[PDB]
Structure 1
Amino acid sequence: MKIAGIDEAGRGPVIGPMVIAAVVVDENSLPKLEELKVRDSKKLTPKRREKLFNEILGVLDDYVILELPPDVIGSREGTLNEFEVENFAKALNSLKVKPDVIYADAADVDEERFARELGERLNFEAEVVAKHKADDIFPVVSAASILAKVTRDRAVEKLKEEYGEIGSGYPSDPRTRAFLENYYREHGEFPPIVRKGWKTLKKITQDMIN
């Protein structure tokens, strides 16, 4: 039986993309995955993590990595939860190898409504197992977290080369606020790297520049 795990990166930051990774592994390939200590990846360095990335791929029957830029996210014609569910589904419906069981990281509490919302959005037959904040609980979801996280890091490390110190990218991080604030100064507008929608972006315009 085919097993899939799905996770997503960049949900909280206000600058940068949001990556959704879905992977499909085989019932007999599961072992080789835990042998990679995927759960114990939070400790690894970016380079060692990137090493894990290429190894995960080599043991997966199939995988998809969706990357959502801030312009797409900050322009959804609906809610945010909806955005995830739809993208989590598109990602799965893109898997050439269809899974029978899918273990997903519930974008928010009430993992049952999430598991249902996604189900009715699958163009194929499969059962879903959602868990809010699946902290390394499901090895299949851990591997998806890696690919989504590596992909995100690369996109951010490139944003630094074009803008410099952009901070952690979180709306609650002053360094990111300064950066935007200062940028919103000599340009009157925000960089094409921010999700024009976060209430955070509001205060920035009222604090400085009055």
Structure 2
Amino acid sequence: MKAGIDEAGKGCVIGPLVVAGVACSDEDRLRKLGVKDSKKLSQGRREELAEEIRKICRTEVLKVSPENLDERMAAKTINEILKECYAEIILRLKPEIAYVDSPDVIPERLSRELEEITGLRVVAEHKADEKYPLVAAASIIAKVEREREIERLKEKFGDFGSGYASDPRTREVLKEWIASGRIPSCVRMRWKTVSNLRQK
């Protein structure tokens, strides 16, 4: 079959990196679920859509915790760590051709390095979920998995916002946490935002 791979949370300061792959025997059946315009859906509707996808397609999810992200980022960039996860998922699914989202606008390099690593056919593109149903589906699975984790974390540490440096709420909560000198484990320490916040 063919497969789509994508991720959720690459740019967050809080929470895990989630990478998912989706492989379907009936791509038309996948399209009927409306994966193409899944972006307008709510967290609840998207979660239901994720379940429908798992019912008709093989799915593989990989999660990297903040702790592990911090460990690996000493020797690698986040994008390379992503490529690592991508190849792992592609190797689980062993598809005929794998379509993957490219962090960089220019995809050629990632495609090469991935084909080199996997020894499989790989087509990468920036914002691939907006061009390939399989990728749109993989994107949905990753987001839902990420959100489930985020919600789990909020029950424990309170509402820290979305987890991205954008959210005013996230930055505010992030500042007090650092100030207290007792930062929750879900915060990515090797993240620029955090570094800068601590430096001052």
TM (norm. structure 1) is 0.89
Cα shift at 1:135: 4.3
90, 98, 112: which is aligned to 1:92?
Answer: 90
Determine the C-alpha separation between the residues in 2 that align with 1:175 and 1:43: 23
Determine the C-alpha separation between the residues in 1 that align with 2:129 and 2:54: 21
Question: Percent of aligned pairs with the same residue?
Answer: 46
**Secondary structure of the structure 1 residue equivalent to 2:138:** helix
Determine the C-alpha separation between the residues in 2 that align with 1:101 and 1:194: 35
Cα root mean square deviation, aligned: 1.4
Cα shift at 1:167: 1.6
**Which has more helix, going by share of residues?**
2
Q: Does 2:97 correspond to 1:104?
A: no
Instruction: Name the structure 1 match of 2:146.
Output: 152
Q: Does 2:10 correspond to 1:11?
A: yes
CA contact 1:16–1:69 (8 Å) conserved in 2: yes
Instruction: Name the structure 1 match of 2:135.
Output: 141
Instruction: Name the structure 1 match of 2:184.
Output: 191
Cα shift at 1:80: 2.0
Determine the C-alpha separation between the residues in 2 that align with 1:159 and 1:193: 8
Amino acid at match of 1:10: G
Q: Does 2:67 correspond to 1:68?
A: no
Determine the C-alpha separation between the residues in 2 that align with 1:148 and 1:120: 25
CA contact 2:189–2:195 (8 Å) conserved in 1: no
Q: From the CA coordinates, give the structure whose radius of gyration is larger.
A: 1
Q: Deviations over 1:36-60 (max 9, x none)?
A: 1101111112111111111101111
Amino acid at match of 1:172: S
Cα shift at 1:178: 1.7
Q: Does 2:49 correspond to 1:49?
A: no
**Secondary structure of the structure 1 residue equivalent to 2:23:** strand
Number of equivalences:
198
Amino acid at match of 2:140: I
**Secondary structure of the structure 1 residue equivalent to 2:146:** helix
CA contact 2:129–2:139 (8 Å) conserved in 1: no
Alignment of 1:96-135 (within 5 A): 98-122=94-118, 125-135=119-129
Determine the C-alpha separation between the residues in 2 that align with 1:103 and 1:66: 17
Determine the C-alpha separation between the residues in 2 that align with 1:45 and 1:199: 30
Cα shift at 1:156: 0.4
Cα shift at 1:206: 4.6
TM (norm. structure 2) is 0.93
Amino acid at match of 1:90: E
Determine the C-alpha separation between the residues in 1 that align with 2:188 and 2:83: 19
Cα shift at 1:94: 2.0
- Structure 2: give runs of 5+ residues left out of the alignment: none
- Structure 1: give runs of 5+ residues left out of the alignment: none
List structure 1 runs of 4+ shifted beyond 4 angstroms. Answer: none
CA contact 1:180–1:191 (8 Å) conserved in 2: no
CA contact 1:6–1:23 (8 Å) conserved in 2: yes
Determine the C-alpha separation between the residues in 2 that align with 1:108 and 1:16: 22
**Secondary structure of the structure 1 residue equivalent to 2:10:** coil
